């Protein structure tokens, strides 16, 4: 099954009352770590992280995050100066990796300014893709440090994947479980002469689910309306797909196929 590890950073200049800096880590859809400029402490966000990582992990990363917080503030200040921007602006970072089912891996590192792509790292050419002339100025300064580029490529391809495999083992009872979906089909005449069919699923984990409507055994040409995959609040998810009308709903979840004939 595909899994990922990602760390986010959010910096806000001149915030209301709201932390100046927040950093959160995730394994798949699960928060694992948190740090902000108010607590000034890195803490676990999953009990399987708290039980498997000794206090020295949290103590050391608290210090590193206090340094990264200070760097983020300065970087956001320089971006505002380059853009000639006043007031409150946001700066974001996302770093991470994925370990695919076939054992292959992906790695990514990206920055955003005011919630829009700003700089995207290409670990295969060791270069930063810039969206505008300010991002280009930063790209030139960052690409001048060859050692840092190589360090980032190593971290994405080796370190990130080793951390992800370690955290996957810690959280295996959560992350590697399967809760099959409970699926139902509801039929109703809506506007006169228009029948809608809803295929609804709930109680499933992992959130990844494939739902479609088929006619006489073939895919439709008519429009399918898709419901978002939503958290139900108990660690499981729900989703739906609907059509207007031999129809059958097809659901695939974690290597199991299901057909509901109407």
């Amino acid at each position, epitope marked *: 099954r595909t899994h990922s590890l990602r760390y986010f950073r959010l910096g806000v200049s001149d915030p209301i009352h709201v932390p100046e800096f927040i950093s959160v880590g995730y394994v798949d859809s699960h928060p694992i770590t948190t740090y902000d400029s108010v607590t*000034r402490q890195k803490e676990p966000r999953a009990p399987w992280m708290a039980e498997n990582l000794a206090p020295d*992990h949290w*103590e*050391r*990363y608290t*210090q*590193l995050l*206090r*340094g990264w*917080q*200070q*760097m983020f503030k300065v970087e956001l200040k320089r971006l505002q100066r380059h853009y000639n921007h006043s007031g409150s602006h946001t700066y974001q970072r996302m770093i991470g990796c994925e370990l695919l089912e076939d054992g292959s891996t992906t790695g990514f590192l990206q920055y955003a300014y005011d919630g829009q792509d700003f700089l995207i790292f290409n670990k295969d050419t060791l270069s930063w893709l810039a969206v505008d002339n300010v991002a280009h100025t930063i790209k030139q300064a960052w690409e001048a*440090n060859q*050692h*840092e580029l*190589l*360090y980032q*490529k*190593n*971290w994405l391809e*080796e*370190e990130c994947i*080793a*951390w992800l495999k370690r955290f996957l083992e810690y959280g295996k009872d959560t992350l590697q479980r399967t809760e099959p979906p409970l699926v139902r089909v509801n039929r109703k005449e809506t506007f006169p002469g228009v029948t809608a069919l809803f295929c609804k699923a709930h109680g499933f984990y992992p959130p990844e689910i494939y739902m479609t409507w088929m006619k006489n055994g073939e895919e439709i040409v008519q429009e399918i309306d898709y419901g978002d995959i939503l958290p139900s609040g108990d660690g499981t998810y729900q989703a739906w797909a609907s059509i207007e009308l031999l129809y059958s709903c097809h659901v695939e979840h974690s290597g199991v196929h299901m057909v509901l004939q109407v």
Partner: antibody
Amino acid sequence: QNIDQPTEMTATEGAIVQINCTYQTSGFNGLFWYQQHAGEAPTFLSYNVLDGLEEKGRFSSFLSRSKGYSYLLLKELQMKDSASYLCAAMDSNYQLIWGAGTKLIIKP
Amino acid sequence: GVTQTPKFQVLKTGQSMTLQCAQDMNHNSMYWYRQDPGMGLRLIYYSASEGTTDKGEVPNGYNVSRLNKREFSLRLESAAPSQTSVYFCASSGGDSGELFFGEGSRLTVLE
């Protein structure tokens, strides 16, 4: 957890010397070499984090991440190369583990 | 780069001592190491940025002050002969950044 480099090496002026450094760490974020003349401060020589050899004048630094091995190679040795050479490996938490240093003696 | 003082100091057992260190390279991270024969450098205390400090590997008998972004002082509360050593201050830009070392401070603690 562990890093090893020879205590001392002796080579002849004009020749070549290879200083080996092996490390076993909990994760890896780079391998550094420093030069430290007697009674002076250490000064940065090289950094390797991907596999390969980097040349900087008469000095080259090699890394094999799969073998947890690095070497510092000094060519056309001069009496001024007599110094201690420190290798340091950065672990997964960006902490350095330092070798005890190699004292390099150059025979005129 | 990194300016540390004093170069040499003789102390009597139980005497107090402060080593000074300043860097003008705009580095967030600063470190205090001791160097002793036959072993690798040992971190005493470090400061990941202004406003924070933390223990290294051998913090006992020492304390530090990150006075501002430039300066990081090391204090020997009650000098002990085991503290006879060569002390190095250093700074780094962080991540893959190398260390920049101060000139070193040779301390000898005598009964």
